[PDB]
Design an enzyme around this catalytic site. Structure first.
Site, mmCIF file in Angstrom:
data_model
loop_
_atom_site.group_PDB
_atom_site.id
_atom_site.type_symbol
_atom_site.label_atom_id
_atom_site.label_comp_id
_atom_site.label_asym_id
_atom_site.label_seq_id
_atom_site.Cartn_x
_atom_site.Cartn_y
_atom_site.Cartn_z
ATOM 1 C CG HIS C 144 79.098 -12.056 -52.023
ATOM 2 N ND1 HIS C 144 78.083 -12.444 -52.875
ATOM 3 C CD2 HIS C 144 78.592 -11.057 -51.263
ATOM 4 C CE1 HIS C 144 77.013 -11.705 -52.644
ATOM 5 N NE2 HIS C 144 77.294 -10.856 -51.670
ATOM 6 C CB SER C 265 103.875 -36.378 -51.819
ATOM 7 O OG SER C 265 105.167 -36.740 -52.264
ATOM 8 C CE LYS C 271 99.863 -30.469 -53.210
ATOM 9 N NZ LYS C 271 98.948 -31.616 -53.498
ATOM 10 C CD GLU C 278 89.792 -33.103 -53.109
ATOM 11 O OE1 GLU C 278 90.504 -32.095 -52.902
ATOM 12 O OE2 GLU C 278 90.207 -34.104 -53.738
HETATM 13 N N1 LIG Z 1 72.497 -7.844 -51.622
HETATM 14 C C1 LIG Z 1 72.199 -8.595 -50.564
HETATM 15 N N2 LIG Z 1 71.299 -9.571 -50.645
HETATM 16 C C2 LIG Z 1 70.546 -9.945 -51.833
HETATM 17 C C3 LIG Z 1 69.375 -10.849 -51.438
HETATM 18 C C4 LIG Z 1 68.188 -10.755 -52.413
HETATM 19 C C5 LIG Z 1 68.464 -11.329 -53.814
HETATM 20 N N3 LIG Z 1 67.646 -10.603 -54.825
HETATM 21 C C6 LIG Z 1 68.193 -12.846 -53.831
HETATM 22 O O1 LIG Z 1 67.159 -13.259 -54.398
HETATM 23 O O2 LIG Z 1 69.022 -13.606 -53.279
HETATM 24 N N4 LIG Z 1 72.762 -8.357 -49.377
HETATM 25 C C7 LIG Z 1 74.180 -8.383 -49.025
HETATM 26 C C8 LIG Z 1 74.482 -7.293 -47.960
HETATM 27 C C9 LIG Z 1 73.300 -6.963 -47.039
HETATM 28 O O3 LIG Z 1 72.213 -6.605 -47.561
HETATM 29 O O4 LIG Z 1 73.482 -7.036 -45.799
HETATM 30 C C10 LIG Z 1 75.223 -8.316 -50.143
HETATM 31 O O5 LIG Z 1 75.505 -9.386 -50.716
HETATM 32 O O6 LIG Z 1 75.757 -7.221 -50.430
#
Ligand SMILES: N/C(=N\CCC[C@H](N)C(=O)O)N[C@H](CC(=O)O)C(=O)O
Ligand SMILES: N/C(=N\CCC[C@H](N)C(=O)O)N[C@H](CC(=O)O)C(=O)O
Ligand SMILES: N/C(=N\CCC[C@H](N)C(=O)O)N[C@H](CC(=O)O)C(=O)O
Ligand SMILES: N/C(=N\CCC[C@H](N)C(=O)O)N[C@H](CC(=O)O)C(=O)O
Lengths: 449, 449, 449, 448
Positions: C144, C265, C271, C278
């Protein structure tokens, strides 16, 4: 063949068209009476029986039978069960062909009104937030590299502007959807000289379809809707990408609320933007629906073919997707917390070398030479191990006599953004103007219904 | 540097197509720079004269691109410097390749959409004109590609024109959002020198100016939109191509394409391969491919400008050229094909009038179901007697239903069959005449807009 | 007869790229004709000698295309007749443009796939070898896009290497089906002269020969498969590109791309814009567009040959050149980028070890749930005490669970953290070493083909 | 937020993985016992409770609760309800990340086994009918125009050959799905030295995943399967188009059985090929799924992201579509009725001009003169208002002295098709060879 039966059957999902299906039948029934196909009493009986079905569906008490192939068949079965053989005159001169598109278009018009409300609320939320946080400045990015100072509101308004174009497209799609197809028959038209104007008025459509074959076989309205939906999801996928990155601990510009993120008790400070990831992923879910209908329609001969039955599931999915996604987006934007502190902290002196060049440009130095001079100051500062805002006036004049003591005004982030007064730029006056224009735009889109 | 990278990053090979619009965008910008005091009157006159020279070099095809030119913008600035010296360098003051490129692309697409509009409206006119002339021709209407009931050949032709008319309406909607000036948005934060954007709008002939610099530089909605319009248009043409290809088979024998739009062998002189229609049908996939490409390029991109956006140009050029060619070939095919009125009428069979026989009774007060049952009996009776239903005796029909009178003989007439559909949009001659009038009025509006 | 039709139907502008394989296909066919007694041995030497001259004109780039040349097949035959005379006409005996064209395209793709394999295997080797050298580097693992736990930088590099290995495997499977000879299928029903197809196979070096003439002429599975393979490969590259782009931001500060693969630049020398990545990311869309177009072209087409199939060449050429360029740029980026071991290490925080603290208890018999609760308590205690969990005293920890011993200090060490993952596939050093050897073996096996 | 909760929730559809989820947990449980995380007695009670949960789903009595976010949560909840606290030790060292991909691959492996069976049956149905109707001849088409006589069996086999390639691709995709991802943890691997080889054997995978990050984040297996499915549907859409066309009254080559067509009592002889239309449309439906997942995956960063949750609905839809579609196609092909008479009647003399030219080619006449000679013959027949087979030898000899009375054999449709003896051609011997090759192919593929 049981596999064939299940595959051909659409009742499992087209049931959602139960209520609009009944409405189209009440309207048609009244036209049949005006045409003399039904008597006044017969009409009363049919309408009263149709009202009962509506309730049965409405209360969730309608009983579907294994014999029911589609919602059309199901409703005619039930009517006959409630009022007898007179229910059989209702389908006179009508076909499942013009009945099904009439149902879908009524459903879509209702759904598009709901989508519009959620879409306009998202836009409004972005615009209001831009009005409140107009003094916040952070870096503007290109190639995901810090470029120059911009107002956080300019960023919010960039998304709002794009969303307003989506709203404009929604209005255009709704217009073509609001055209009555009932009375096209199986393909050559209605054979009983049915009063289509009466049907239009009753069902509240804006006008009636021009050609029966086209009316029956086209799914332009489905493709159109799916194209609008997909571009809207592209916009949301981009806003999602921006916000997920800004929410990283690395960027540290903002934090999503507990309702729109996930976390762990072991790392209480870590918030995962599940809401934005869900939104981003729906761009693909929606695009896939657009892709499928375009392929279903490609190379099909006139007029009606069973291939067209694939429209329903795609439309329902996208309607529900858009409805859910827009509300979550609204919630995310209205409840996230920004860190003005971290946003300002990210502004660096190095981002003002372009402004140093513009300082020379405003004094009559050609663009090329001003660029060269600024580059020299940047290099000179690098060799001295200091930042350009720390170069002494003497240092600057060694590069250009044109650098005066007022050059100190360049090294100010507010001054930097305030250079952008030309319409649509990030200067405060320009942002203020944009908010006025969007407020007016929202008004006329809501107005157009 | 890396040669493979340089080649991949370079856009000059294809973006040279924007040569003229790029020059036009620079002339307008030059004029605005003079009004802002960045250029003097004399500098302006020399710059304009120089750009005018470059415009002619490209026009006559004598412009010389150098290995060093990474894009069309760079080539034009290099050449302007070769022509007028140092002052050329002041032209890019406050401008970015970011706002320059979308300005160029929108100007190019606006002019291209005008050309496309011209060809689309000609196709529609061609179909409508032919429908007006071959208005008495009757042939089978199809569903599931099986003979259903008689319809007018003109009703079939108008079904395609109606769909193409919606395509033309969508074109106008896309053109509107394309006709908005993005120049003066800078790299992302706006123009830094208070450039007069209203002046730029008037010089370039755009309808209005962009609301937000970030959105103006990063969005490619106008590309996506154009591609969605083009794809649905191709869908329609693939359906019309499928129809004609089938109708042109020896099995159907309804029509024959002209030599210009088909191919053949001297060994089988009567065999005409519909190459034109197959080319057209396949372009649906070609155009849809560009739409899918750009949607994927944009999905999930962060704000603001990213090099990913450079993919828009080859997609736009391909689609514009594809539509221009395809629309003209379709017009040619429709205007020059030869139909076989004899084969079309010969295809109409008595069996197709069984529904009309039931409608006959329906118009006499017989309940839908019973009249349907009665027509079935007649069909069966005729079967066991080895005769067509238009050959069953009045006494025979009367044994089935007493409501069959001698006037029932008028049911067995294909002209009478199509004339049942007088309800708006049906296949009766008066409805077809109405449609022709409506489409012409619609085209009048779309052309005067 | 119609100029637009002619230009649209003609393929010489692009299929011209098949010049050399088309000549090789004719030499093999000529030899087969000689075996069939259609050509004399003397006639064969002339034909072969003529084809060789044509091969050279193309090679030297001196072949002159004529306005009458509808395609490369026609171009080459024209030239042959110009070189050796009437005997040139015997070459096409029993052959068709239908089986000739697919032979040419598969020979071309077999050759192109061999080149793509080399580039793909080089990219994979670059990741594997860099992983080996930088095996001691540790940085945050992300989910995430939030810091989750320490991982070896090499585990990250190898994750991309493993996915690309599956792409290489698919390339191999696609190549196997492309390596089947279609020549000798005629227009649709087969070669009518009892041509020796085995001889054709041998001469052109295919692995086997097509099983059915109708399928061999109409199927474009090999085009679709290649496109599916290319699209998944691009998906992998778009993900690696996204990762590297984010890691190269100043916010993350994990790595810097070399000058050759980035732009910038003089005003902001620090930078570095990742144009290279890309460009690569956007090509996922460009390649997917081609897959989408061919699938749409093929859907619902009837047997056997149709002009629609001509859309295959441009899609194949584009994807071949795109992959060839992208893989090499990718190889350059990976091999020349510089990582910041210092910043990667500074990103590792004690907060990321709370899960390890729970695992410490689990290995001493504390049930999962209770250990998790215990670790959570330590986290809260640290918070209240104003320190980080690696600073809590043994007395502090013992107050949470008596199972905490002095050795718990070993939990707070990032190397010890990644070393817990010794189970196959994990990030411990021994597992990373194992993966490298497994990948070196896979590359060897695949390189052997 | 209720909307957020509903959108994030996957229980409504992922509960279809109820059984494989359980099998995954049992295998995991056994591995935990071996590693010493669970006692043999703790293992016996866990497996007993998982067994009961397995039955509740089977009997359709499992009660899903509003609190259940997904199938994994629902099973663990019920497991605790059934056996108490010991339940909580099951997830030790496991993540929903490696748990969900394990379940999906197990499910897809079972699904591919069923798909393979129906696909091979479709191929067999086509091949065996081809053997039986080997003598039937009809027109061959290009540009949907009658070109030359060919055997009906050559047409059936053209589809069987393409379908055999789809089968080969299925086998390739299956191999990569048959790789164990369990033991990858959340992203860095399993932290307790779980015996992955044991997990592999218990779950019956062929091997184990090489890299934990890749194992948890890739959905190549979903893409590949959807690619295999999309190309298969393309083939079926093409076959549907042919059959729909051949069933028109205008062509009149065949009729579908009542089971796979629809009609009306008002027009008894009219049959609508609804089955074939449904089949054709599913190409778009499956392609849509392919398109969606490709877009979902494009540009995603490592490692796990909630975006990946979109894979399940696409896989389920496509598995169910192929299963139904393949079986309907098998029925259509096995039960349709051809009109040998109509197919034959459609063969025209003009379809033999090419053969006439070929006749001269075998006599040693250069291709170009041969072609020209046949052309002058067709034109002479036209003028005379007769068919090329009506030309006299004398008339033929005037065009080319190579024409001998044996030119009579050219004007015969069976001799026409019998020219194509080169492998893969439409001559009877070549069709016989194809039938044999395909029977062996199916054997090799079945012995998968
Ligand atoms: N929630 C989780 N996984 C979701 C997988 C299943 C989900 N319904 C899908 O289909 O991807 N796990 C991690 C943490 C973990 O379970 O280790 C998280 O993002 O918090
Ligand atoms: N079956 C039918 N229309 C089906 C429309 C509804 C269908 N569930 C869909 O979604 O397209 N009607 C015509 C005849 C008619 O009802 O006029 C037919 O195909 O036989
Ligand atoms: N190079 C550039 N834009 C490229 C736009 C044209 C490009 N060929 C395209 O097609 O997008 N601009 C900025 C800086 C600027 O020109 O303001 C950059 O990336 O550094
Ligand atoms: N024109 C033709 N094949 C075209 C193949 C090459 C084409 N540029 C393509 O790429 O498909 N051949 C057949 C007949 C034949 O050449 O045997 C025809 O359509 O007449």
């Amino acid at each position: 063949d049981p596999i064939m039966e299940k595959l051909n059957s659409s009742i499992a999902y087209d049931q959602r068209l139960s209520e609009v299906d009944i409405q189209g039948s009440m309207a048609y029934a009244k036209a049949l009476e005006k045409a003399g196909i039904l008597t006044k009493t017969e009409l009363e009986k049919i309408l009263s029986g149709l009202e009962k079905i509506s309730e049965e569906w409405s209360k969730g008490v309608f009983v579907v039978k294994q014999s029911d192939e589609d919602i059309h068949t199901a409703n005619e079965r039930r009517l006959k069960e409630l009022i007898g053989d007179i229910a059989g005159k209702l389908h006179t001169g009508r076909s499942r062909n013009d009945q099904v598109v009439t149902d879908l278009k009524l459903f879509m018009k209702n759904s598009l009104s709901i989508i519009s409300t959620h879409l306009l609320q998202l836009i409004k939320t972005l615009v209001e937030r831009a009005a409140i946080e107009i003094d916040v400045i952070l870096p503007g990015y290109d190639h995901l590299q810090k470029a120059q100072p911009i107002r956080w509101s300019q960023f919010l308004l960039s998304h709002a502007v794009a969303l307003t174009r989506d709203s404009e497209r929604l209005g255009e799609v709704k217009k073509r959807i609001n055209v009555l197809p009932l009375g096209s028959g199986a393909l050559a038209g209605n054979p009983l000289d049915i009063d289509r104007e009466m049907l239009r008025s009753e069902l509240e459509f804006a006008s009636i379809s021009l050609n029966s074959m086209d009316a029956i076989s086209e799914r332009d309205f489905v493709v159109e809707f799916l194209s609008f939906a997909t571009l809207l999801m592209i916009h949301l996928s981009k806003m999602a990408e921006d916000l997920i990155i800004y929410s990283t601990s690395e960027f540290g510009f903002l934090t999503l609320s507990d309702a729109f993120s996930t976390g762990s008790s072991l790392m209480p400070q870590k918030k995962n933007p599940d809401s934005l990831e869900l939104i981003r992923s729906k761009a693909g879910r929606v695009f896939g629906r657009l892709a499928s209908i375009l392929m279903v329609l490609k190379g099909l001969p006139s007029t009606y073919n069973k291939d067209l039955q694939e429209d329903k599931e795609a439309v329902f999915d996208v309607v529900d997707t858009l409805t859910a996604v827009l509300q979550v987006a609204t919630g995310v934007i209205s409840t996230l917390q920004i860190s003005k502190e971290n946003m300002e902290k990210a502004l660096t002196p190095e981002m003002l070398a372009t402004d140093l060049a513009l300082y020379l440009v405003r004094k009559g130095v050609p663009f090329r030479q001003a660029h060269t001079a600024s580059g020299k100051a940047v290099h000179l500062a690098e060799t001295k191990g200091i930042t350009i805002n720390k170069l002494s006036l003497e240092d600057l004049k060694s590069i250009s006599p044109q650098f005066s003591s007022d050059v100190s005004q360049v090294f100010n982030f507010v001054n930097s953004v305030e250079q952008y007064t030309a319409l649509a730029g990030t200067a405060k006056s320009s942002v203020t103007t944009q908010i006025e224009q969007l407020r007016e735009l929202m008004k006329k889109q809501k107005e157009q219904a």
